[PDB]
Amino acid sequence: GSHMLLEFKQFLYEASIDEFMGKIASCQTLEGLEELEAYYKKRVKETELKDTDDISVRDALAGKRAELEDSDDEVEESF
């Protein structure tokens, strides 16, 4: 069946944004987005993330961060 093309961009350039942009768009909490932000920083030495993931996802993750930071009304700091 299907496998990595080994000599092309395409399989990586789908890789970048396949669930992660959803995972941040769904993060529901800045405190979680920030854990996603640490998990992004934890991961991308363990793999590669090219240019493509980093901009697309960060601009979204940071995209959400401002929203979520408006949404700072989170657990125990405000119950």
Curated annotation (Swiss-Prot):
Protein keywords: Late protein
Domain of life: Viruses
A Pfam family per the record: UvsW-1
Keyword ATP-binding belongs to the record: no
Assembly information from the UniProt record: Probably interacts with UvsW.
Purpose: Inhibits the single-stranded annealing activity of UvsW, has no effect on UvsW helicase activity.
Protein name: Protein UvsW.1
Gene name per UniProt: uvsW1
